Design a protein around this ligand. Structure first.
Ligand code: 5GS
Ligand code: CL
Ligand code: MN
Ligand code: MN
Ligand code: MN
Length: 536
RNA sequence: AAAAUUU
RNA sequence: AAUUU
């Protein structure tokens, strides 16, 4: 029935200019050599993306769907949710949010300039009066950095971002922000992934695993999820929103956004031409994340039911899903998973790669990450979260006139501090760089490099400084990724680390603490690391 | 472009 | 600011 998009043939033009790497990358040329492999997805590539996501959806629901949808509305209605004042919504706007066509941007919105507020007032008026005229949206290519992979095609084409004008974005928040804060957790409970921290994610998975007599796990991800979302899914989304206690004024705003924006509309490129027409999710609207998550969850819980998955414990984040169930033997597990996929496929959520039962927690990947295990200081098993370092390393080498990658180095150091690739490679590089630069004291992304030990002890536990005996999968994957980007292998990073360590120690102060906690892995005779005052 | 988590 | 979807 529904085509996902149609296209005039106008191009998807760039919003800014898309910078090139330069013949010299002075921050990362000591980190890796293969700079030719590191690229940013361009707007020229958007054409290729559009072909891959334009297709005809058909959808066939069933008693299991209906049943799951019903139960989900009974959950929804134990929720009441308020409108947000025009003003409170204005100030959830991000500081750099793309400006409005009507002569103001986010500074004005956040400061409640009166031109901005009056335009927003009229926009909300029109939402309440007119509940049908479609609302124009802008279409743009997302710029992100990867490492080329010739196995899987060369370069990925850019994903498509589709969004309404700033005025409209504020009105969405007025109508729905409060819902986004309450509905998913109410509807999905413990299954709602975003509620958890990484530590909690890991623990939730181990508890789920431990409680099965005989566990089986898998993960699922939908190919081009936003384009698989049907008009009917979006209206069913509305009807889930409506099932809460709402002010009548919200209901009209919800219903109107739904019919005017969410289910479809025309799309314009940055130069103003009509680009095409859309009848799936616009990724760029306030409801993108909540919607995806709720919709994914309905389809998934139904498909579990269609396929016989026993005692499923779920975890859902957007279109990404893990299910840990009671195995019915491998012959049955294979068959049930094929059934799961058939169902999701009927529901219009077809797999990127077909899923597969697993019986070892390390082999389940979701949101480009997985759980792994090492040994702690006293020899106890320590479970932690990690990932292929390929992309983060490529992003670590993205230097342009307009972009430094140092913040990315730090981001990953914090998020993945227990991993062997952060501890040996990124930490070593980061500290080496700043020492020589003599900018340790300086803040970056509102964090002081010299706090890191406290920060990591707070977030990952003191065990992140003493972990050893990493897994084969993890050693293999790391070695393989450093070889792939032409970076030095782990032994060299051991040498560089000893030096960085010595120089930090002999600097005294917080540096020396950094050098002793972060790099104790690097010395032959360890120290005994005690908790840190600063952390509690 | 939107959200969540981390800080 | 970082990461993720
Ligand atoms: C664009 C999205 O709606 C997207 O389709 C969905 C699932 O992401 P995915 O990583 O599995 O990609 P597919 O589209 O399924 O190929 O998460 C949203 N999403 C994802 C990435 C992003 O920057 N913004 C976004 O709103
Ligand atoms: Cl231990
Ligand atoms: Mn997907
Ligand atoms: Mn309605
Ligand atoms: Mn996904």
């Amino acid at each position: 029935s529904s085509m996902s998009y149609s296209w005039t043939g106008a191009l998807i033009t760039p919003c800014g200019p898309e910078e090139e790497k330069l013949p010299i990358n002075p921050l990362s040329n000591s980190l890796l050599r293969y700079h030719n492999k590191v690229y940013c997805t361009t707007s020229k590539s958007a054409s290729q993306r559009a072909k891959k996501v334009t297709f005809d959806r058909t959808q066939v629901l069933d008693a299991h769907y209906d049943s799951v949808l019903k139960d989900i509305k009974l959950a929804a209605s134990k929720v009441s949710a308020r409108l947000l004042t025009l003003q409170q919504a204005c100030q959830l706007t991000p500081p750099h949010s793309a400006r409005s066509k009507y002569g103001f941007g986010a500074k004005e919105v956040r400061s409640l300039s009166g031109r901005a507020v009056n335009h927003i007032k009229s926009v909300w008026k029109d939402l309440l009066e007119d509940p049908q005229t479609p609302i124009p949206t802008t279409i743009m290519a997302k710029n992100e950095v990867f490492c080329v992979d010739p196995a899987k095609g060369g370069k990925k084409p850019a994903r498509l971002i589709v969004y309404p004008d700033l005025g409209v974005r504020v009105c969405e928040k007025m109508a729905l922000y409060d819902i986004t804060q309450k509905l998913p957790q109410a509807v999905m409970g413990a299954s709602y992934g975003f509620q958890y921290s990484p530590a909690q994610r890991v623990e939730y998975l181990l508890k789920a695993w431990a409680e099965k007599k005989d566990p089986m796990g898998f993960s699922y991800d939908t190919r081009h999820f936003d384009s698989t979302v049907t008009e009917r899914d979006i209206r069913t989304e509305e009807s889930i929103y409506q099932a809460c206690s709402l002010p009548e004024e919200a209901r009209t705003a919800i219903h109107s956004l739904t019919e005017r924006l969410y289910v479809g509309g025309p799309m314009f490129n940055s130069k103003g031409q009509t680009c095409g027409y859309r009848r799936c999710r616009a990724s760029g609207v306030l409801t993108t994340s909540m919607g995806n998550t709720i919709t994914c969850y309905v389809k998934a819980l139904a498909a579990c039911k269609a396929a016989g998955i026993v005692a499923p414990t779920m975890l859902v984040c957007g279109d990404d899903l893990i299910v840990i169930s009671e195995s019915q033997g491998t012959e049955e597990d294979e068959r049930n998973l094929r059934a799961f996929t058939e169902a999701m496929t009927r529901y219009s959520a077809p797999p990127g790669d077909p899923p597969r039962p697993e019986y070892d927690l390390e082999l389940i990947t979701s949101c480009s990450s997985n759980v792994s295990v090492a040994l702690g200081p006293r020899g106890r098993r320590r479970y932690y979260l990690t990932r292929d370092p390929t992309t983060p390393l490529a992003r670590a080498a993205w230097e342009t006139v307009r972009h430094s990658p140092i913040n990315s180095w730090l981001g990953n150091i914090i998020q993945y501090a227990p991993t062997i690739w952060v501890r040996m490679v990124l930490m070593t590089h980061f500290f080496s760089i700043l020492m020589v630069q003599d900018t340790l004291d300086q803040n970056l992304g509102g964090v002081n490099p010299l706090d890191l030990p406290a920060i990591i002890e707070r977030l990952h536990g003191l065990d992140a400084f003493s972990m050893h005996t990493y897994s084969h999968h993890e050693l293999t994957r790391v070695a393989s990724a450093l070889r792939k980007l032409g970076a030095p292998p782990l032994r060299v990073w051991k040498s560089r680390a000893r030096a960085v360590r010595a120089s930090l120690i002999s600097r005294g102060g917080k540096a020396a603490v950094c050098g002793r906690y972060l790099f104790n892995w690097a010395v032959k005779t360890k120290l005994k690391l005690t908790p840190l005052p600063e952390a509690r």
